[PDB]
Amino acid sequence: EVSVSLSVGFKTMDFPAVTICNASPFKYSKIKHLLKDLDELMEAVLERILAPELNLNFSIWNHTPLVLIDERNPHHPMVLDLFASEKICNAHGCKMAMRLCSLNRTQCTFRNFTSATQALTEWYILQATNIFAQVPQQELVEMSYPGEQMILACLFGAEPCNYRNFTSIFYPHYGNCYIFNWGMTEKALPSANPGTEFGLKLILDIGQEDYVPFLASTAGVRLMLHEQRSYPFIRDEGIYAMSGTETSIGVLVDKLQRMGEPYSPCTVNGSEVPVQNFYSDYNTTYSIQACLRSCFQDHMIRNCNCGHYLYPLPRGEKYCNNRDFPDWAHCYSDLQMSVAQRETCIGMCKESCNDTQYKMTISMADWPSEASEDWIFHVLSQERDQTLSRKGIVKLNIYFQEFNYRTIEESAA
Amino acid sequence: VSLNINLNSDKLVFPAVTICTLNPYRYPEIKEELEELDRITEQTLFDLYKYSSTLPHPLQRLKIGFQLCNQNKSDCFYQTYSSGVDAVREWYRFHYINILSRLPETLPSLEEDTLGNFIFACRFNQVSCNQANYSHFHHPMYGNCYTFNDKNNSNLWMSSMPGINNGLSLMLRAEQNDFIPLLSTVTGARVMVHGQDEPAFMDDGGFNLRPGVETSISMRKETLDRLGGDYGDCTKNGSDVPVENLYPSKYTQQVCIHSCFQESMIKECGCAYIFYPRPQNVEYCDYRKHSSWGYCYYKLQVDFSSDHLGCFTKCRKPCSVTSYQLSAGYSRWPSVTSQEWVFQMLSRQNNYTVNNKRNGVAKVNIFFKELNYKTNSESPS
Amino acid sequence: TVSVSIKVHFRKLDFPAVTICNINPYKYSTVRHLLADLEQETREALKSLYGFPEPRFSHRIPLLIFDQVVGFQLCSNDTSDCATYTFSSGINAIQEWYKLHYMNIMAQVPLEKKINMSYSAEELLVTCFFDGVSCDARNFTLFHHPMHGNCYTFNNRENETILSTSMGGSEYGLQVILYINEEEYNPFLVSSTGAKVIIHRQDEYPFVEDVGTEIETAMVTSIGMHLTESFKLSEPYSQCTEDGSDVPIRNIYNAAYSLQICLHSCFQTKMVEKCGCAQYSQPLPPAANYCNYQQHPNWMYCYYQLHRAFVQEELGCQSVCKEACSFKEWTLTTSLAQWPSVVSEKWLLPVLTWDQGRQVNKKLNKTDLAKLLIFYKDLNQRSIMESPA
Ligand SMILES: *[C@@H]1O[C@H](CO)[C@@H](O[C@@H]2O[C@H](CO)[C@@H](O)[C@H](O)[C@H]2NC(C)=O)[C@H](O)[C@H]1NC(C)=O
Ligand SMILES: *[C@@H]1O[C@H](CO)[C@@H](O[C@@H]2O[C@H](CO)[C@@H](O)[C@H](O)[C@H]2NC(C)=O)[C@H](O)[C@H]1NC(C)=O
Ligand SMILES: *[C@@H]1O[C@H](CO)[C@@H](O[C@@H]2O[C@H](CO)[C@@H](O)[C@H](O)[C@H]2NC(C)=O)[C@H](O)[C@H]1NC(C)=O
Ligand SMILES: *[C@@H]1O[C@H](CO)[C@@H](O)[C@H](O)[C@H]1NC(C)=O
Ligand SMILES: *[C@@H]1O[C@H](CO)[C@@H](O)[C@H](O)[C@H]1NC(C)=O
Ligand SMILES: *[C@@H]1O[C@H](CO)[C@@H](O)[C@H](O)[C@H]1NC(C)=O
Ligand SMILES: *[C@@H]1O[C@H](CO)[C@@H](O)[C@H](O)[C@H]1NC(C)=O
Ligand code: NA
């Protein structure tokens, strides 16, 4: 029997950690030399599907051939490879799939797709990850969006800031991310005044001209509010922000403190879990999401002798490439599309007794006005260069509402 | 104590809606004082950023920021900024606040149709609210504000059934060309829903609006009731708190905090802050009357944020805490098949000059998501 | 005495039903012959009242000029009392007057013809995706709404298991691309352009107009939701009812019991007893007919008096209806961003129109395709149970 106590209001507390990731993982102007043969092959696949009437590198195509499954004839289903109308079928009985072979093109499986716009994205991501897994990280970070050009302005209340106050990490899905107030080296900045005037003010530059065409579709900027010593999982808990608007974000710290171990299966420190944490290089606190990615990466190395690119890699292991482990495409597919292994890891991982959420309300408005667009863009371009349009500049106003916390504490009674 | 969560199925009174525009109206009284301020800013941009379109605190590059000092010019410190956008905005704001306190203390005598030019249509629960009593006040950072369904209005808006059809429907005008481009750098409008008696804190619970989209705002009412005295330290009045309530409203957490900070602003710096109400005798701040008030205000925030003034300990929490969660659903309001007659209708009635580049006018819908709002009440055990 | 107990669970939870629906009910080129005289009479009101430079319709409810204020009045048979509606805005008066006749012209059209004239599952949907496996139009159940045409729910189909998500994130959830043909929008009926969805259970009736959230037709909308369940004691403590067994009101929605469903069913039942016709905005009770000025000329004032007595609690619906004990809720977190970038638009639109080739002959525009992401940010299922003490 535990007692539940609710207390909402306003109090002085530390400002949430603001993680800033760009939509595209890398700049196309600095990575086109690495994705030259892939993009040249992707344009050929588009021409084969869109306008068939109107050299290539088949070493990339033979890794995962995008085939067409024409099964509208129940007595004769056929599978045709893309590489007197010569159009490609798009009727109700036809479909497009990816042929994933395991051992010498014998144990080949099909990842079926109904629309071509989805199969082309999944095929390009699988081929791009194959190239991004065989390049060192020290070289893979410099070919992404730097913090000097993204963060054009930073003003937390009355104290200014710049790209040097943002901790730079490399999220393998969104490239270089920047955390405003993390708290690993210096103490977290508290805020005791609600309102946009006392909150965080940011002016970000989203360069859409350097986006990867076949990899990054959305032209926004990812934002996440998390704790001070927690790893930012952008794909799970992450919001967007339109380009050319002022996104006001009112934060509300909604906490829930569980009773303890003898009353609920929750951990405090996080060292009681059996699986080892692969995020130990960041010195962050325990997180349930970090345990779900450490088990999957451990199961990934267990089946095939390689680790995925979208997850941390232990010391001594190697990422999944095509020149070393050609079976990683079938290996990763059998582990991603498997609800059985997902349920096993959830049972092994435990939750934290003190969880924290941020019930944030998003309100946007067109920031660059017709009267202020002249001098604003002239100042920002003068500081960056010595290139900016409505699609580039992003305005963010993060702050606390009238009530900034809502704690639900459980007490033994 | 013991927490008891329940749902109240009663006639939901519609909260007061504060509608503010995003362009501060420059008064003709301070037109000569503002044109001089713009000339100093245009000269500042041309000297620093070469942008071609005597004040006590000039903006200079050292970063870019203005110097703040005390009376005897002993503890001088520079308030620097990273970019010129934030530097010019805050520097213009500081001088705009000082010259805004020089306005006369008399009531306006020139009745101008300032509401009809902003609100193109009002309709609550299939009933027009164009001819309704409201309260007008000019926010420094934002524009003119209009609060509807206030305590002073006898006709209280009652929401019978939840949904968009039985809620507030507004159509505001987002002026693309602001009166002050050096300070107003955002187009749209703000809407804040608060209690019938509670004041309007546009910085705390403001909700921006994009020009040219229909924003259906769903309100979820959340209230918390707790006992006071021996069970808790909450207060159901302002007599228990020694802080004098400066707002003409009931007791609230932020109302007492703003009042407690304003008293410390008057005792130390000698002048009252503009963004907060003032008593009948103390006047607002101005660099001509008070030689140095920005330095005293900056150092006051340092002591206030460190809980040195004691405003967080003196201001207790109210026993009745009501909140409104806002969830919006956006959609482009001008349809390509209706821009012909809709934009032409506004040009005939409201004389709205249609602009093919940007939309301008924006529609807003406010309503309750659920009729049974959650009520959290505590009970002894 | 009761005691609340808030406990969270982390496991594979079920995915709710997403009632995707376009705000434009029917293509204007399809229902032009039904609304031909209504469109002509509407434009004549613009040139007369506002002075523009320039199933049958009833001329009994015209637009008049009351003392620059325009509107219309709804009188009774004896013409003793008239329920008038005044308007201060021009666009607001036309949309309300057009919708008044639109609800009466479409009420005398057979249901089978209305479903055929609205959008299909393959025309409204361009791309379906959920938890890796790609879905199609067969995975959506038809749901005809009188205002939004045909709505399609992702889950909630008969003789099929409920889809459940086991990995949180925007990629392992619902990822649909909607086709919103803005060129065939009704000029006077609907003002904005876009789609709207409703997050509900498989046994809950989706209220599109009440608790529906609109979606912009030009950009992507990511909706992160958290499941929050609540349970309350029924008989001795809160007097709440479960499964709708204690209340004698018949449920005409054919779904689970709710307070809004009980009030609407009670108002519909009281309406058929008062006047011979039933309201068109709500589903039709058994052995009844919809309302229209052609067959029921005195229903505009009949509904006015009933609604006037329903708010004042005089019909007897708020006292008999009781709140439901248990119910779920999804705290939606909406986030918008430009879906087609300047560079990806060159290859997305030509491919997105290749999938929808039979329904669309030209190239899809950026303002016609709306992408939607609905998923669980976390698998934390917060349950609030009230145990007796
Ligand atoms: C992808 O689709 C193909 C074809 O629709 C599936 O393959 C078939 O499997 C069924 C039953 O196992 C057989 O009756 C067919 O003869 C097979 N056809 C071919 C061409 O192999 C395949 O199982 C699907 N894969 C997934 C993961 O859904
Ligand atoms: C951004 O970082 C700079 C330094 O990297 C901070 O400047 C320091 O601020 C502290 C206040 O705690 C002073 O004690 C130091 O003297 C300052 N150092 C320098 C070099 O000026 C700045 O405060 C940070 N701003 C934010 C918003 O975090
Ligand atoms: C959409 O419906 C189809 C069938 O109506 C689903 O396809 C089945 O998928 C399961 C996998 O969970 C297979 O075991 C069955 O053999 C399939 N049957 C058929 C007839 O194809 C499909 O999974 C549904 N889509 C989603 C996203 O759930
Ligand atoms: C095809 O690409 C691979 C790596 O992407 C490269 O090693 C190979 O040389 C390329 N083929 C040709 C013919 O250039
Ligand atoms: C959660 O609250 C408990 C209660 O005091 C505290 O001991 C614990 O440190 C908190 N968790 C974190 C991560 O600070
Ligand atoms: C200047 O004034 C401050 C406060 O007003 C005081 O602390 C300081 O001693 C003064 N300095 C001199 C030299 O008078
Ligand atoms: C609370 O204050 C009001 C006026 O502010 C006063 O009329 C009332 O008597 C007070 N009640 C208590 C219990 O102090
Ligand atoms: Na503005």
PDB file of N, CA, C and O in Angstrom, chain A residues 6 10 153-154 160-161 193-195 197 201 246 248 364 366-368 370 373-374 378 383 390 395 403 405, chain B residues 49 51 82-84 86 89-90 93 176 185-187 203-204 208 210-211 254 275 301 304 317 323 355 358:
ATOM      1  N   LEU A   6       0.211  14.438  -5.288  1.00  0.00           N
ATOM      2  CA  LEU A   6       0.367  15.288  -6.459  1.00  0.00           C
ATOM      3  C   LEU A   6       0.607  16.724  -6.015  1.00  0.00           C
ATOM      4  O   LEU A   6      -0.079  17.223  -5.116  1.00  0.00           O
ATOM      5  N   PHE A  10       5.078  26.166  -9.483  1.00  0.00           N
ATOM      6  CA  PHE A  10       6.297  26.733 -10.042  1.00  0.00           C
ATOM      7  C   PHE A  10       7.390  26.727  -8.985  1.00  0.00           C
ATOM      8  O   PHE A  10       7.140  27.051  -7.820  1.00  0.00           O
ATOM      9  N   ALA A 153      22.671  32.176 -33.471  1.00  0.00           N
ATOM     10  CA  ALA A 153      22.446  33.012 -32.302  1.00  0.00           C
ATOM     11  C   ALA A 153      22.054  32.130 -31.128  1.00  0.00           C
ATOM     12  O   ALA A 153      21.469  31.057 -31.305  1.00  0.00           O
ATOM     13  N   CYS A 154      22.382  32.595 -29.926  1.00  0.00           N
ATOM     14  CA  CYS A 154      22.073  31.857 -28.704  1.00  0.00           C
ATOM     15  C   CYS A 154      21.991  32.859 -27.565  1.00  0.00           C
ATOM     16  O   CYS A 154      22.951  33.599 -27.325  1.00  0.00           O
ATOM     17  N   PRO A 160      24.575  35.445 -22.951  1.00  0.00           N
ATOM     18  CA  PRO A 160      24.725  34.985 -24.334  1.00  0.00           C
ATOM     19  C   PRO A 160      25.432  33.633 -24.387  1.00  0.00           C
ATOM     20  O   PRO A 160      25.958  33.134 -23.394  1.00  0.00           O
ATOM     21  N   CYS A 161      25.437  33.047 -25.581  1.00  0.00           N
ATOM     22  CA  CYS A 161      26.082  31.761 -25.815  1.00  0.00           C
ATOM     23  C   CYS A 161      26.332  31.616 -27.309  1.00  0.00           C
ATOM     24  O   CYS A 161      25.844  32.403 -28.121  1.00  0.00           O
ATOM     25  N   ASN A 193      12.398  32.158 -13.649  1.00  0.00           N
ATOM     26  CA  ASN A 193      11.437  33.126 -14.171  1.00  0.00           C
ATOM     27  C   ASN A 193      10.737  32.520 -15.380  1.00  0.00           C
ATOM     28  O   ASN A 193      11.416  32.087 -16.334  1.00  0.00           O
ATOM     29  N   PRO A 194       9.408  32.460 -15.394  1.00  0.00           N
ATOM     30  CA  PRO A 194       8.705  31.944 -16.572  1.00  0.00           C
ATOM     31  C   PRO A 194       8.536  33.018 -17.633  1.00  0.00           C
ATOM     32  O   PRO A 194       8.359  34.201 -17.330  1.00  0.00           O
ATOM     33  N   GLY A 195       8.592  32.593 -18.892  1.00  0.00           N
ATOM     34  CA  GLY A 195       8.406  33.514 -19.996  1.00  0.00           C
ATOM     35  C   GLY A 195       9.475  33.413 -21.062  1.00  0.00           C
ATOM     36  O   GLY A 195      10.575  32.917 -20.803  1.00  0.00           O
ATOM     37  N   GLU A 197      11.129  35.822 -22.365  1.00  0.00           N
ATOM     38  CA  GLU A 197      12.226  36.751 -22.115  1.00  0.00           C
ATOM     39  C   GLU A 197      13.309  36.128 -21.245  1.00  0.00           C
ATOM     40  O   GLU A 197      14.481  36.507 -21.354  1.00  0.00           O
ATOM     41  N   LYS A 201      16.710  31.393 -26.308  1.00  0.00           N
ATOM     42  CA  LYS A 201      16.418  31.955 -27.621  1.00  0.00           C
ATOM     43  C   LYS A 201      17.495  31.495 -28.588  1.00  0.00           C
ATOM     44  O   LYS A 201      18.685  31.715 -28.342  1.00  0.00           O
ATOM     45  N   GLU A 246       8.812  30.942 -35.792  1.00  0.00           N
ATOM     46  CA  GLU A 246       9.255  31.080 -34.407  1.00  0.00           C
ATOM     47  C   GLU A 246       8.492  30.058 -33.570  1.00  0.00           C
ATOM     48  O   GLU A 246       7.335  30.282 -33.202  1.00  0.00           O
ATOM     49  N   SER A 248       7.629  28.514 -30.371  1.00  0.00           N
ATOM     50  CA  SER A 248       7.641  28.720 -28.930  1.00  0.00           C
ATOM     51  C   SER A 248       7.300  27.412 -28.229  1.00  0.00           C
ATOM     52  O   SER A 248       6.278  26.787 -28.531  1.00  0.00           O
ATOM     53  N   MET A 364       3.734  28.081 -33.061  1.00  0.00           N
ATOM     54  CA  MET A 364       4.594  28.646 -34.086  1.00  0.00           C
ATOM     55  C   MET A 364       3.968  29.901 -34.682  1.00  0.00           C
ATOM     56  O   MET A 364       2.770  30.159 -34.533  1.00  0.00           O
ATOM     57  N   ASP A 366       5.147  32.884 -38.127  1.00  0.00           N
ATOM     58  CA  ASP A 366       6.132  33.305 -39.117  1.00  0.00           C
ATOM     59  C   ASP A 366       7.041  34.382 -38.542  1.00  0.00           C
ATOM     60  O   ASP A 366       6.600  35.508 -38.291  1.00  0.00           O
ATOM     61  N   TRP A 367       8.312  34.045 -38.331  1.00  0.00           N
ATOM     62  CA  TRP A 367       9.235  34.941 -37.647  1.00  0.00           C
ATOM     63  C   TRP A 367       9.727  36.066 -38.557  1.00  0.00           C
ATOM     64  O   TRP A 367       9.562  37.239 -38.202  1.00  0.00           O
ATOM     65  N   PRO A 368      10.322  35.786 -39.737  1.00  0.00           N
ATOM     66  CA  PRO A 368      10.844  36.885 -40.561  1.00  0.00           C
ATOM     67  C   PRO A 368       9.711  37.686 -41.182  1.00  0.00           C
ATOM     68  O   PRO A 368       9.043  37.231 -42.117  1.00  0.00           O
ATOM     69  N   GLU A 370       8.015  41.015 -43.216  1.00  0.00           N
ATOM     70  CA  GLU A 370       8.381  41.722 -44.439  1.00  0.00           C
ATOM     71  C   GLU A 370       9.159  42.997 -44.145  1.00  0.00           C
ATOM     72  O   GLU A 370       9.927  43.463 -44.994  1.00  0.00           O
ATOM     73  N   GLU A 373      12.831  41.538 -42.494  1.00  0.00           N
ATOM     74  CA  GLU A 373      13.601  40.538 -43.227  1.00  0.00           C
ATOM     75  C   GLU A 373      14.861  41.135 -43.841  1.00  0.00           C
ATOM     76  O   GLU A 373      15.844  40.418 -44.057  1.00  0.00           O
ATOM     77  N   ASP A 374      14.857  42.440 -44.117  1.00  0.00           N
ATOM     78  CA  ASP A 374      15.998  43.067 -44.775  1.00  0.00           C
ATOM     79  C   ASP A 374      17.210  43.118 -43.851  1.00  0.00           C
ATOM     80  O   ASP A 374      18.291  42.627 -44.193  1.00  0.00           O
ATOM     81  N   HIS A 378      20.612  40.483 -43.338  1.00  0.00           N
ATOM     82  CA  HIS A 378      21.872  41.140 -43.668  1.00  0.00           C
ATOM     83  C   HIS A 378      22.872  41.022 -42.526  1.00  0.00           C
ATOM     84  O   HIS A 378      24.081  40.914 -42.759  1.00  0.00           O
ATOM     85  N   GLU A 383      27.720  38.081 -40.271  1.00  0.00           N
ATOM     86  CA  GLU A 383      28.450  37.393 -39.211  1.00  0.00           C
ATOM     87  C   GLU A 383      28.922  36.014 -39.656  1.00  0.00           C
ATOM     88  O   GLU A 383      30.031  35.593 -39.308  1.00  0.00           O
ATOM     89  N   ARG A 390      14.178  32.141 -46.459  1.00  0.00           N
ATOM     90  CA  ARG A 390      13.094  31.723 -45.576  1.00  0.00           C
ATOM     91  C   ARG A 390      13.207  30.254 -45.196  1.00  0.00           C
ATOM     92  O   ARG A 390      12.786  29.862 -44.103  1.00  0.00           O
ATOM     93  N   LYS A 395      13.735  29.855 -35.843  1.00  0.00           N
ATOM     94  CA  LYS A 395      13.687  30.564 -34.571  1.00  0.00           C
ATOM     95  C   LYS A 395      13.035  29.671 -33.526  1.00  0.00           C
ATOM     96  O   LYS A 395      11.963  29.108 -33.768  1.00  0.00           O
ATOM     97  N   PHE A 403       3.197  27.098 -14.751  1.00  0.00           N
ATOM     98  CA  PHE A 403       3.526  25.948 -13.920  1.00  0.00           C
ATOM     99  C   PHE A 403       4.557  25.113 -14.664  1.00  0.00           C
ATOM    100  O   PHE A 403       4.272  24.593 -15.748  1.00  0.00           O
ATOM    101  N   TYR A 405       6.474  22.472 -13.236  1.00  0.00           N
ATOM    102  CA  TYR A 405       6.698  21.125 -12.733  1.00  0.00           C
ATOM    103  C   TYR A 405       5.387  20.534 -12.238  1.00  0.00           C
ATOM    104  O   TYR A 405       4.496  21.252 -11.776  1.00  0.00           O
TER     105      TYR A 405
ATOM    106  N   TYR B  49      27.665  46.618 -39.548  1.00  0.00           N
ATOM    107  CA  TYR B  49      27.357  45.654 -40.595  1.00  0.00           C
ATOM    108  C   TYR B  49      27.221  46.286 -41.973  1.00  0.00           C
ATOM    109  O   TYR B  49      26.875  45.581 -42.926  1.00  0.00           O
ATOM    110  N   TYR B  51      24.998  48.119 -43.205  1.00  0.00           N
ATOM    111  CA  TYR B  51      23.630  47.974 -43.684  1.00  0.00           C
ATOM    112  C   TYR B  51      23.041  49.352 -43.965  1.00  0.00           C
ATOM    113  O   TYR B  51      22.932  50.182 -43.057  1.00  0.00           O
ATOM    114  N   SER B  82      25.825  37.525 -28.602  1.00  0.00           N
ATOM    115  CA  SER B  82      26.546  36.730 -29.589  1.00  0.00           C
ATOM    116  C   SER B  82      26.334  37.255 -31.004  1.00  0.00           C
ATOM    117  O   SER B  82      27.301  37.417 -31.758  1.00  0.00           O
ATOM    118  N   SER B  83      25.090  37.523 -31.381  1.00  0.00           N
ATOM    119  CA  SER B  83      24.755  37.986 -32.718  1.00  0.00           C
ATOM    120  C   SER B  83      24.199  39.402 -32.666  1.00  0.00           C
ATOM    121  O   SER B  83      23.761  39.887 -31.620  1.00  0.00           O
ATOM    122  N   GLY B  84      24.223  40.065 -33.824  1.00  0.00           N
ATOM    123  CA  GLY B  84      23.675  41.405 -33.922  1.00  0.00           C
ATOM    124  C   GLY B  84      22.164  41.456 -33.896  1.00  0.00           C
ATOM    125  O   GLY B  84      21.596  42.505 -33.577  1.00  0.00           O
ATOM    126  N   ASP B  86      20.123  39.635 -31.847  1.00  0.00           N
ATOM    127  CA  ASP B  86      19.746  39.721 -30.440  1.00  0.00           C
ATOM    128  C   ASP B  86      20.264  41.000 -29.797  1.00  0.00           C
ATOM    129  O   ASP B  86      19.620  41.541 -28.892  1.00  0.00           O
ATOM    130  N   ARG B  89      18.016  43.908 -31.003  1.00  0.00           N
ATOM    131  CA  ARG B  89      16.673  43.725 -30.463  1.00  0.00           C
ATOM    132  C   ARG B  89      16.610  44.120 -28.993  1.00  0.00           C
ATOM    133  O   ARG B  89      15.696  44.838 -28.571  1.00  0.00           O
ATOM    134  N   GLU B  90      17.575  43.660 -28.195  1.00  0.00           N
ATOM    135  CA  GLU B  90      17.566  43.975 -26.770  1.00  0.00           C
ATOM    136  C   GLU B  90      17.968  45.420 -26.506  1.00  0.00           C
ATOM    137  O   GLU B  90      17.450  46.043 -25.572  1.00  0.00           O
ATOM    138  N   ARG B  93      15.004  47.432 -27.364  1.00  0.00           N
ATOM    139  CA  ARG B  93      13.988  47.187 -26.345  1.00  0.00           C
ATOM    140  C   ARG B  93      14.229  48.046 -25.110  1.00  0.00           C
ATOM    141  O   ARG B  93      13.292  48.629 -24.553  1.00  0.00           O
ATOM    142  N   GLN B 176       1.716  42.280 -41.751  1.00  0.00           N
ATOM    143  CA  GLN B 176       3.033  41.894 -42.247  1.00  0.00           C
ATOM    144  C   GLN B 176       4.060  42.993 -42.002  1.00  0.00           C
ATOM    145  O   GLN B 176       5.198  42.710 -41.609  1.00  0.00           O
ATOM    146  N   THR B 185       9.730  41.617 -34.696  1.00  0.00           N
ATOM    147  CA  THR B 185      10.303  40.749 -35.715  1.00  0.00           C
ATOM    148  C   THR B 185       9.561  39.421 -35.780  1.00  0.00           C
ATOM    149  O   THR B 185      10.171  38.351 -35.815  1.00  0.00           O
ATOM    150  N   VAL B 186       8.232  39.475 -35.780  1.00  0.00           N
ATOM    151  CA  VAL B 186       7.409  38.273 -35.873  1.00  0.00           C
ATOM    152  C   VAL B 186       6.019  38.684 -36.339  1.00  0.00           C
ATOM    153  O   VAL B 186       5.480  39.706 -35.905  1.00  0.00           O
ATOM    154  N   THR B 187       5.449  37.889 -37.240  1.00  0.00           N
ATOM    155  CA  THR B 187       4.105  38.110 -37.753  1.00  0.00           C
ATOM    156  C   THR B 187       3.160  37.050 -37.207  1.00  0.00           C
ATOM    157  O   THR B 187       3.533  35.881 -37.073  1.00  0.00           O
ATOM    158  N   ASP B 203       3.682  36.311 -21.639  1.00  0.00           N
ATOM    159  CA  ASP B 203       4.960  35.612 -21.704  1.00  0.00           C
ATOM    160  C   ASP B 203       4.876  34.211 -21.113  1.00  0.00           C
ATOM    161  O   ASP B 203       5.584  33.308 -21.570  1.00  0.00           O
ATOM    162  N   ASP B 204       4.018  34.010 -20.113  1.00  0.00           N
ATOM    163  CA  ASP B 204       3.938  32.715 -19.444  1.00  0.00           C
ATOM    164  C   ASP B 204       3.087  31.728 -20.237  1.00  0.00           C
ATOM    165  O   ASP B 204       3.564  30.661 -20.637  1.00  0.00           O
ATOM    166  N   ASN B 208       1.269  31.351 -29.788  1.00  0.00           N
ATOM    167  CA  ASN B 208       1.429  32.053 -31.051  1.00  0.00           C
ATOM    168  C   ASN B 208       0.529  31.445 -32.125  1.00  0.00           C
ATOM    169  O   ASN B 208      -0.017  30.348 -31.976  1.00  0.00           O
ATOM    170  N   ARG B 210       0.108  31.151 -36.588  1.00  0.00           N
ATOM    171  CA  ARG B 210       0.763  31.480 -37.849  1.00  0.00           C
ATOM    172  C   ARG B 210      -0.213  32.189 -38.783  1.00  0.00           C
ATOM    173  O   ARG B 210      -1.401  31.858 -38.809  1.00  0.00           O
ATOM    174  N   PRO B 211       0.266  33.168 -39.550  1.00  0.00           N
ATOM    175  CA  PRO B 211      -0.617  33.860 -40.499  1.00  0.00           C
ATOM    176  C   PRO B 211      -0.986  32.954 -41.664  1.00  0.00           C
ATOM    177  O   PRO B 211      -0.116  32.390 -42.331  1.00  0.00           O
ATOM    178  N   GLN B 254       2.200  33.223  -9.587  1.00  0.00           N
ATOM    179  CA  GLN B 254       2.974  34.203 -10.343  1.00  0.00           C
ATOM    180  C   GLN B 254       2.521  35.629 -10.058  1.00  0.00           C
ATOM    181  O   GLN B 254       3.313  36.567 -10.204  1.00  0.00           O
ATOM    182  N   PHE B 275       6.739  46.170 -17.220  1.00  0.00           N
ATOM    183  CA  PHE B 275       6.025  44.922 -17.469  1.00  0.00           C
ATOM    184  C   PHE B 275       5.185  44.468 -16.282  1.00  0.00           C
ATOM    185  O   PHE B 275       4.384  43.540 -16.433  1.00  0.00           O
ATOM    186  N   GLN B 301      17.952  40.690 -10.650  1.00  0.00           N
ATOM    187  CA  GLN B 301      17.593  39.369 -11.154  1.00  0.00           C
ATOM    188  C   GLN B 301      18.545  38.301 -10.632  1.00  0.00           C
ATOM    189  O   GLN B 301      18.145  37.149 -10.424  1.00  0.00           O
ATOM    190  N   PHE B 304      17.344  37.683  -7.252  1.00  0.00           N
ATOM    191  CA  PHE B 304      16.020  37.073  -7.299  1.00  0.00           C
ATOM    192  C   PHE B 304      16.100  35.610  -7.719  1.00  0.00           C
ATOM    193  O   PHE B 304      15.371  34.765  -7.187  1.00  0.00           O
ATOM    194  N   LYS B 317       1.549  28.876  -2.198  1.00  0.00           N
ATOM    195  CA  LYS B 317       0.821  28.419  -3.374  1.00  0.00           C
ATOM    196  C   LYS B 317      -0.682  28.465  -3.117  1.00  0.00           C
ATOM    197  O   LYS B 317      -1.128  28.192  -2.000  1.00  0.00           O
ATOM    198  N   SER B 323      -5.400  24.892 -14.510  1.00  0.00           N
ATOM    199  CA  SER B 323      -4.516  24.986 -15.662  1.00  0.00           C
ATOM    200  C   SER B 323      -5.288  24.628 -16.923  1.00  0.00           C
ATOM    201  O   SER B 323      -6.328  23.966 -16.874  1.00  0.00           O
ATOM    202  N   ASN B 355      -2.416  40.448 -50.377  1.00  0.00           N
ATOM    203  CA  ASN B 355      -1.029  40.327 -50.807  1.00  0.00           C
ATOM    204  C   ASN B 355      -0.811  38.921 -51.344  1.00  0.00           C
ATOM    205  O   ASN B 355      -1.049  37.938 -50.634  1.00  0.00           O
ATOM    206  N   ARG B 358       2.359  36.873 -49.181  1.00  0.00           N
ATOM    207  CA  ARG B 358       2.074  36.283 -47.884  1.00  0.00           C
ATOM    208  C   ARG B 358       0.583  36.378 -47.585  1.00  0.00           C
ATOM    209  O   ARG B 358      -0.108  37.281 -48.064  1.00  0.00           O
TER     210      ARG B 358
END
